[PDB]
């Protein structure tokens, strides 16, 4: 049967679970001029160094089956 | 009682639900030189123009109670 399967539905789960929860919409804005050679930005909301990627996405992806990863601005 | 409350637990929900699901870890990398005056990057995995923000985060935040928003690289 399909009695164990949750049918297709509009998502209700949060993405960010703990970061800056007194801020109603977390936005970051950086000037290119202040960036060094490389900046690696977190898109999974699990990094301890958010907004910078710290490799936490690997645990997120393994535990949930997801496929997210960071955004890189270089040169 | 607390019979309606889901206790604190390690997350199991995905963040990305539909984007590039044949890619096992979605990473984007851009050279500053190719960026114009402003780039607004999606961190919610709902944008129709992912990896660029299209304001979909507003619906995500309203429907789930979350507080995520984009990453801006300017100048
Ligand atoms: N697309 S990938 O697997 O080769 C890749 C993957 C990753 C990754 O971290 O998975 C990455 N992050 C660099 C980093 C991590 C912490 C600080 O900088 C960069 C790249 Cl190019
Ligand atoms: N922190 S905020 O509420 O003032 C803000 C909020 C947003 C926002 O979209 O919520 C934003 N996005 C600009 C955009 C949207 C689509 C293309 O560029 C920029 C800013 Cl500075
Ligand atoms: S730690 Fe979040 S994308 Fe790498
Ligand atoms: S649409 Fe995803 S952060 Fe704006």
Residue numbers in the entry:
A (entry chain A), B (entry chain A): 31 to 105
What do the authors say?
MitoNEET (gene cisd1) was identified in 2004 as the first example of a mitochondrial outer-membrane iron–sulfur protein, with the cluster binding domain facing the cytosolic side1. This protein was initially discovered as the unintended target for the anti-diabetic peroxisome proliferator-activated receptor gamma (PPAR-γ) agonist pioglitazone, as many of the beneficial effects of pioglitazone, a thiazolidinedione (TZD), could not be explained by PPAR-γ activity alone. MitoNEET assembles as a homodimer, with each subunit containing a rather unusual [2Fe–2S]-type iron–sulfur cluster coordinated by His87 and three cysteine residues2. The amino acids coordinating the [2Fe–2S] cluster form a signature CDGSH domain common to all members of the CISD-gene family.
Here, we present the first crystal structure at 1.95 Å resolution of human mitoNEET with a bound benzoic-sulfonamide-furan ligand, furosemide. We focused on furosemide in this study due to its appropriateness for the X-ray diffraction studies, due to its favorable solubility profile, as opposed to the glitazones where solubility in the crystallization mother liquor is limiting. In the refined structure, furosemide is bound on the face close to the [2Fe–2S] cluster in each monomer, which are critical for the biological function of mitoNEET. The bound ligand was supported by strong density after MR-SAD phasing and refinement, and was further confirmed by simulated annealing OMIT map analysis. The furosemide carboxylic groups are in reach of the [2Fe–2S] coordinating His87 side chain for possible hydrogen bonding with His87Nε. The furosemide-binding site observed in the crystal structure corresponds to previously hypothesized binding pocket, from molecular docking studies performed with the anticancer drug MAD-28 corroborating our finding. In accordance, the Phe82 side chain is within a 5 Å distance from the furosemide furan ring in the refined structure, which could suggest that this is the same binding site that pioglitazone occupies. The primary binding site identified correlates with the redox-active [2Fe–2S] cluster ligation site, and binding to the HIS87 and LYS55 may inhibit its redox function and/or possible cluster release/breakdown at the cytoplasmic side.
